Design a binder for these strands. Sequence first.
DNA 1: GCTCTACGTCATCA
DNA 2: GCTCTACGTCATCA
Lengths: 114, 115
Amino acid sequence: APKCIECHINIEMDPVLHDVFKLQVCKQCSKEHPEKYALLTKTECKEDYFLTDPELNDEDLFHRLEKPNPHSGTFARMQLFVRCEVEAFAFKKWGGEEGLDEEWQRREEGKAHR
Amino acid sequence: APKCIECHINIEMDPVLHDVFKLQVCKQCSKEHPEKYALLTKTECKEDYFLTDPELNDEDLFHRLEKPNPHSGTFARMQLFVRCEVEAFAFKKWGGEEGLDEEWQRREEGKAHRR
DNA sequence: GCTCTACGTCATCA
DNA sequence: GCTCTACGTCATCA
Ligand SMILES: [Zn+2]
Ligand SMILES: [Zn+2]
């Protein structure tokens, strides 16, 4: 039987990570490894990884899970991205965690000025 | 016979002004009154009247005539607006021709500021 | 720790 | 005198 790629034990995958993000990952393992499997909102992807609307709205570039906006179902739908995908793109984009942190430095300096 | 609203004489309206912009105005009268009937690109509307993409892209708000982009038919289509409509909406927005010149003063100063 | 876009410039590519 | 949007911030309203 096919096994979880993290633990190599469980055979029952997390429905969301499996069906939406195509990751063969069990629910316990998702919770133990949030550094890979945590689900990030659209707003968090902008803040933390400096991804833009053009990058995040590309359906060819990230898997996403949509849900009703928790503040109101009349507001625009919440979109959730898996950390490992977002992070890998942002690393190619800014040049690794080093690059990302430099970019974070650059912006904070920008903001200190204003 | 229905007559041109500027001259009150011609019976044959400018096809573009009549068909696209709904103005009962003859071609000669349009050439004589560019201050009303001149066709402005999308870009001129932004430059001259500070209208935004959201206003100009509103199909309920301006009549527009599209044409192939004259630089290349692979580029975005040219959009032409009629000055009377664009001007009338810009006067409501900025507070008449006076307010528009003010808004112009402001932005030229902003650009000077940045040097 | 929700999302979209206006506010406004401007280059670049299309 | 061509047009769309990224580049970026951020409030506001949705
Ligand atoms: Zn597992
Ligand atoms: Zn006439």
